[PDB]
């Protein structure tokens, strides 16, 4: 009937622990968590069947809630290999089978020595064009129109085909970090 | 155990297409998805013995037969109005709902042929700056203004594919994303140690692979015909 998943998107450093959670306005007589990569088939996890159930897969634990409504996946030490979209899938006796929205979990891979710093690269064939490269931030770093664009590992790249487009607008108002490295 | 085919399927408004699923997991149970980015998975059609199709929530304008217990195939018809989407079949044991999934395809749907373009791709050279502050180099390869969204890339060097030290865009972002009628870019990052860019006997090369048009697909505009094709450009070794 309606299958809630929360939050919609997480952004965490490698080594942190996370829960995400199933919540149904119906009972199910079973609950599935599948993990998807882009543009690839979802993979099943586990399936839960009695309310109440722990189940321990390595790195991952699932609990279904005594009543059979709710459900929550947790990650042990994240990796960058989880990252993915994470599907809560379940049906109830009506026996309609019904798929959450998923979470989209981003696992930011470590750096020990962190070097934040914004780039300016020029094109091989110099068109004289260029891109902005923001690289070597830390998990703590989240990164005005549809001309600038965007591209988010710790890496970030921006570009434009205006020509007073400079990296220090492209990267700025956002969140570069205190001490980033921002040559000329 | 689940094959879909092909990968990417592009087709003009008002043709229909025939998706592929093909099993050997011994399954009864067999299901059409349909997966757009603000939805998850809506079932289209579910067939949990051969012979038997129930219709899901957005069956309207697809059809499927399940005449074989190994194979379901997905029609969609010019009655769906909005088919662009990533279709997933899966199948499952008849008294249950743990699916196994095949690997998905991307199908497109344009108003017109005229629509498609391939990329342009550049690649943009490692910063001096950054050689002497880190010791290393990224380079960036840009895939820009094409459609549809169909595309694989890859870095090459002298020759060989490379995966490590490898960055990609998981999908093509939309160059207009707040808007329905868009081109696609996919931007990449290579990073090497400094030693290794700074050799000018090393080359570089980021290359796109694009589906588009296919032989049978009619063509009378001056430009080049926009079939799938390759796309590169290279970057050389500079011993500054």
């Known amino acids: 009937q309606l299958l809630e998943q929360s939050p919609q998107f997480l952004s965490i450093q490698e080594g942190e622990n996370l829960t995400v959670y199933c919540n149904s306005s119906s009972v199910f007589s079973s609950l599935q968590w599948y993990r998807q990569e882009p543009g690839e088939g979802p993979v099943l996890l586990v399936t839960v069947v009695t309310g109440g159930e722990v189940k321990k897969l390595k790195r991952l634990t699932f609990q279904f809630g005594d009543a059979r409504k709710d459900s929550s996946l947790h990650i042990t030490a994240a990796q960058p290999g989880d990252t993915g979209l994470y599907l809560c899938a379940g049906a109830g006796s009506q026996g309609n089978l019904i798929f959450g929205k998923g979470t989209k979990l981003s696992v930011k891979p470590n750096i020990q020595n962190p070097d934040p710093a914004v780039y300016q690269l020029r094109d091989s064939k110099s068109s004289d064009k260029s891109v902005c490269l923001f690289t070597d931030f830390d998990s703590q770093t989240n990164v005005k129109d549809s001309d600038v664009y965007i591209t988010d590992s710790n890496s970030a790249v921006a570009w434009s085909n205006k020509s007073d487009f400079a990296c220090a607008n492209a990267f700025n108002n956002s969140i570069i970090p205190e001490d980033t490295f921002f040559p000329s | 155990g689940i094959t879909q085919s092909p990968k990417y399927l592009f087709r003009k408004e008002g043709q229909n297409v025939t998706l592929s699923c093909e099993q050997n997991?011994?399954?009864?149970?067999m299901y059409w998805y349909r997966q757009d980015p603000g939805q998850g998975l809506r079932l289209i059609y579910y067939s949990q013995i051969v012979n038997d199709f129930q219709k899901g929530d957005i069956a309207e304008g697809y059809s499927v037969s399940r005449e074989k217990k190994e194979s379901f195939p997905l029609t969609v018809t010019s009655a769906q109005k909005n088919p662009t989407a990533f279709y997933l079949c899966?199948?499952?044991?008849?008294?249950?709902?743990?699916?196994?999934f095949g690997p998905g395809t991307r199908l497109t749907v344009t108003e017109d042929l005229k629509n498609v373009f391939p990329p342009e791709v550049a690649v943009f050279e490692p910063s001096e700056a950054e050689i002497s502050h880190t010791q290393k180099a990224t380079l960036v390869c840009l895939a820009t203004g094409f459609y549809p969204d169909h595309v694989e890339l890859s870095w090459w060097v002298n020759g060989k594919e490379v995966h490590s030290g490898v960055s990609t865009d998981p999908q093509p972002l939309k160059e207009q994303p707040a808007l329905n009628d868009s081109r696609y870019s996919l931007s990449s990052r290579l990073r090497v140690s400094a030693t290794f860019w700074q050799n000018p006997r090393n080359h570089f090369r980021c290359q796109v692979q694009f589906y588009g048009l296919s032989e049978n697909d009619e063509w009378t505009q001056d430009r080049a015909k926009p079939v799938t094709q390759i796309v590169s450009a290279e970057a050389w070794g500079r011993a500054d």
């Open positions: 997991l011994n399954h009864d149970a």
């Open positions: 899966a199948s499952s044991s008849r008294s249950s709902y743990e699916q196994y």
